[PDB]
Design a protein around this nucleic acid. Structure first.
Ligand SMILES: Nc1nc2c([nH]c(=O)n2[C@H]2C[C@H](O)[C@@H](COP(=O)(O)OP(=O)(O)OP(=O)(O)O)O2)c(=O)[nH]1
Ligand SMILES: [Ca+2]
Ligand SMILES: [Ca+2]
Ligand code: NA
Length: 327
DNA sequence: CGGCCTACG
DNA sequence: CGTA
DNA sequence: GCCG
């Protein structure tokens, strides 16, 4: 078992679902307290279990697995012996956890805002609605649409949506393409939102594209909310339903074709996978990775990549298809 | 112990 | 601060 | 919280 999640295949479904879910609760709670370090360890431990070829049945099977120390091992031990971990259950029922989860789920609210609201004594969505003067325009949209945004987006909804985005994109710039990224590209059948990556095969033609796309989507009556030169837009879209519609979060991002492999890799995730890949790159290879490129700070040069395969090769890693990046 | 991904709106 |  |  290698130490970085980007060094091992992690499938979407696996053999340790209950154990991973418990560790991820502890990870999430650590994030609500501002401990990114402990959030990372619990996420990494969870991800290790996702990568195993069969169920963990005995405590001895954790010996020598990376990211399992005294704490994560005790969590697994208790689950194996009793079916339940007292620490996890205490977190699940804490007012702090439940409220921070509720608030951070709102589009436009992060941990810092949620925590301040918690310290002010606020606990429910109706508490936030009663004092609407304190909300940003983003948070008001987030609150208004919260019920719809809490319903999973189905993979079966995505194709019709991609088609409407493609029509707007084709008008904005003939020849521009739309690629489905995020969890759906990793094989998920649901998601909290839809992620699209837009480019054009002629380098430079994509400049100024996103505003043109957004204007056209807005003219079609499809945009319930968006922030408005730019290259990422975090929107709420109107998605057709039988006799009606629902609000759906959609991310649109533009990249030049030179950067497309880096953008595709970054936006395809998973979030832990990409953090681990970037850490691997810097710490093991001395190269700086982001969604735009891969930089050698000794030579002061960018790696040219024509594919995700190129990027894995330049980092000395075995290629993983998107379906095995579910860290 | 230091480090924990790296960007854009 | 929010967002990915 | 864990790794190196
Ligand atoms: N490097 C980096 N990438 C991120 C972060 N947050 C984040 O979502 N991403 C990337 C990895 C994700 O898989 C991708 C899309 O984000 P997402 O929140 O829509 O996640 P998803 O599609 O996997 O999940 P979901 O919609 O099924 O819930 O963007 C971050 O903080 N850093
Ligand atoms: Ca998504
Ligand atoms: Ca997204
Ligand atoms: Na939020």
């Amino acid at each position: 078992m290698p130490a970085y999640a980007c060094q091992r295949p992690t499938p979407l479904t696996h053999h340790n679902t209950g154990l991973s879910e418990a560790l991820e609760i502890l990870a999430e709670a650590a994030g609500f307290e501002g401990s990114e370090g402990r959030l990372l360890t619990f996420c990494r431990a969870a991800s290790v279990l996702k990568a195993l070829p069969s169920p963990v049945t005995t405590l001895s099977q954790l010996q020598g697995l990376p990211h399992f120390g005294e704490h994560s091992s005790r969590v697994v031990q208790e689950l194996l012996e009793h079916g339940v971990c007292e620490e996890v259950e205490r977190v699940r029922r804490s007012e702090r956890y439940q409220t921070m989860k509720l608030f951070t789920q709102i589009f436009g609210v992060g941990v810092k805002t949620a925590d301040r609201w918690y310290r002010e004594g606020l606990r429910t969505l109706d508490d936030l609605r009663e004092q609407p003067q304190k909300l940003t325009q983003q948070q008001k949209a987030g609150l208004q649409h919260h019920q719809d945004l809490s319903t999973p987006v189905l993979r079966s909804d995505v194709d019709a949506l991609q088609q409407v985005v493609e029509e707007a994109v084709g008008q904005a710039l003939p020849g521009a393409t739309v690629t489905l990224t995020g969890g759906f590209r990793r094989g998920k059948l649901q998601g909290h939102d839809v992620d699209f990556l837009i480019t054009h095969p002629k380098e430079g033609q994509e400049a100024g594209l996103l505003p043109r796309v957004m204007c056209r989507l807005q003219d079609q009556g499809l945009i319930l909310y968006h922030q408005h030169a730019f290259e990422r837009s975090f929107c709420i879209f109107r998605l057709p339903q039988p006799g009606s519609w629902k609000a759906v979060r959609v991310d649109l991002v533009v990249a030049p074709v030179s950067q497309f492999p880096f953008a595709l890799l970054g936006w395809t995730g998973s979030k832990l996978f990409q953090r681990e890949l970037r850490r691997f790159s810097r710490k093991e290879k001395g190269l700086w990775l982001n969604s735009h490129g891969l930089f050698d700070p000794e030579q002061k040069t960018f790696f040219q990549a024509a594919s995700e395969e190129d990027i894995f090769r330049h980092l000395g890693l075995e290629y993983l298809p998107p379906e095995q990046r579910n860290a």
